[PDB]
């Protein structure tokens, strides 16, 4: 069983968000944690995994905590060599640390999901997979573009991040104060017909909780990059 399309009344409307859209833009504008062939070295709470990942670019962190849907998922990846890709946040990000030759025995940055096994998850000959994104504006297919990934089974999160990064730079998806769009959702259609979507707009109100918004990625949902179909539905 897949997820039914969004009803008219459940989609978040940007006009109803009176906070600063820049806080949403932040999460997707050339913003992401990426690591290759790493293994967790610790755990804060039962549902999370701690990794030693330092962004050689900007160097804002050396420790990354990613929270999963439950202990079973965490245990599945805990001792495997994995690849990581996701959107991180700092506000309300906390977890005690104990190590040396790094930070002051403290945390650094947080995220949800974003984990894929490294072994057997890449294409031969170092090929990259192009994934097509069809964008619909007011029920009209205005533009289509491609994003790439080197993973066979990639997290929906990675594809979502790359799709929004493009849209932010090419269509001003999110601006500092607001957005030119009223509603927007990204829909994934799998080869087996299964479908699911994420609301691209912040919940109504004057504040945006980045931690709460990103939590949707904690299911570590992955899709076959070779066959998945993606659609972005926007309205002005």
CA-closest candidate to residue 14, choices 200, 167, 170: 200
Selected range binding Zn ion among 62-70, 85-93, 125-133, 208-216, rule: CB under 5 A: 62-70
Which residue number, 71 or 182, has a Cβ lying nearer to Zn ion?
Answer: 71
Binding to Zn ion by residue 70, rule CB under 5 A? yes
Which residue number, 41 or 45, has a Cβ lying nearer to Zn ion?
Answer: 45
Of 29, 42, 55, 71, the one binding Zn ion (CB under 5 A) is 71
Which residue number, 47 or 134, has a Cβ lying nearer to Zn ion?
Answer: 47
Selected range binding Zn ion among 65-73, 91-99, 102-110, 183-191, rule: CB under 5 A: 65-73
Of 83, 158, 160, 231, the one binding Zn ion (CB under 5 A) is 83
- Which residues are bridge partners to 134 per DSSP? 144, 231
How far CA 16 is from CA of 135, 208, 216, in Å, comes to: 23, 12, 21
231 is in an annotated binding site: no
With beta carbons less than 8 A apart as the criterion, state whether 154 and 193 touch: no
Which residue number, 83 or 231, has a Cβ lying nearer to Zn ion?
Answer: 83
Alpha helices in the chain (DSSP H): 22-28, 71-78, 156-171, 210-214
Which residue number, 56 or 98, has a Cβ lying nearer to Zn ion?
Answer: 56
83 is in an annotated binding site: yes
What's the CA gap between 50 and 44, in Å, rounded? 7
With beta carbons less than 8 A apart as the criterion, state whether 173 and 200 touch: yes
In the block, tokens 């949902």 appear at: 221
Of 103, 118, 134, 221, the one binding Zn ion (CB under 5 A) is 118
In whole angstroms, the minimum distance from the beta carbon of 96 to Zn ion comes to 19
Cα dihedral 137, 139, 144, 147 sign: positive
In whole angstroms, the minimum distance from the beta carbon of 216 to Zn ion comes to 17
What's the CA gap between 71 and 45, in Å, rounded? 9
* Positions in the binding site for Zn ion (CB under 5 A): 70-71, 83, 118
Q: Which residues are annotated as a binding site?
A: 9, 47, 71, 80, 83, 118-119, 122
């Amino acid at each position: 069983e897949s997820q039914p399309d969004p009803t008219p009344d459940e989609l978040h409307k940007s006009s109803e968000f009176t906070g600063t859209m820049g806080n949403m833009k932040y999460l997707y504008d050339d913003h992401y944690v990426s690591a290759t062939k790493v293994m967790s070295v610790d755990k804060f709470l039962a549902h999370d995994l701690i990794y030693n990942i330092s962004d050689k670019k900007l160097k804002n962190y050396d420790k990354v905590k990613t929270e999963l849907l439950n202990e079973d998922l965490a245990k599945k990846y805990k001792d495997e060599v994995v690849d990581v890709y996701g959107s991180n946040y700092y506000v309300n990000c906390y977890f005690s640390s104990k190590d040396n030759v790094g930070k002051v025995t403290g945390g650094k940055t947080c995220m949800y999901g974003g984990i894929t096994k490294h072994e057997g998850n890449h294409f031969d000959n170092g090929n990259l997979q192009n994934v097509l994104i069809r964008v619909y504006e007011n029920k009209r297919n205005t533009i289509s573009f491609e994003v790439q990934t080197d993973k066979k089974s990639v997290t929906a999160q990675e594809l979502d991040i790359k799709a929004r990064n493009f849209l932010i730079n090419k269509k001003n998806l999110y601006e500092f104060n607001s957005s030119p769009y009223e509603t927007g959702y990204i829909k994934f259609i799998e080869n087996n017909g299964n479908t699911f979507w994420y609301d691209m707009m912040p919940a109504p109100g004057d504040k945006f909780d980045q931690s709460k918004y990103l939590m949707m990625y904690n299911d570590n949902k992955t899709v076959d990059s070779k066959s998945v179909k993606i659609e972005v539905h926007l309205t002005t």
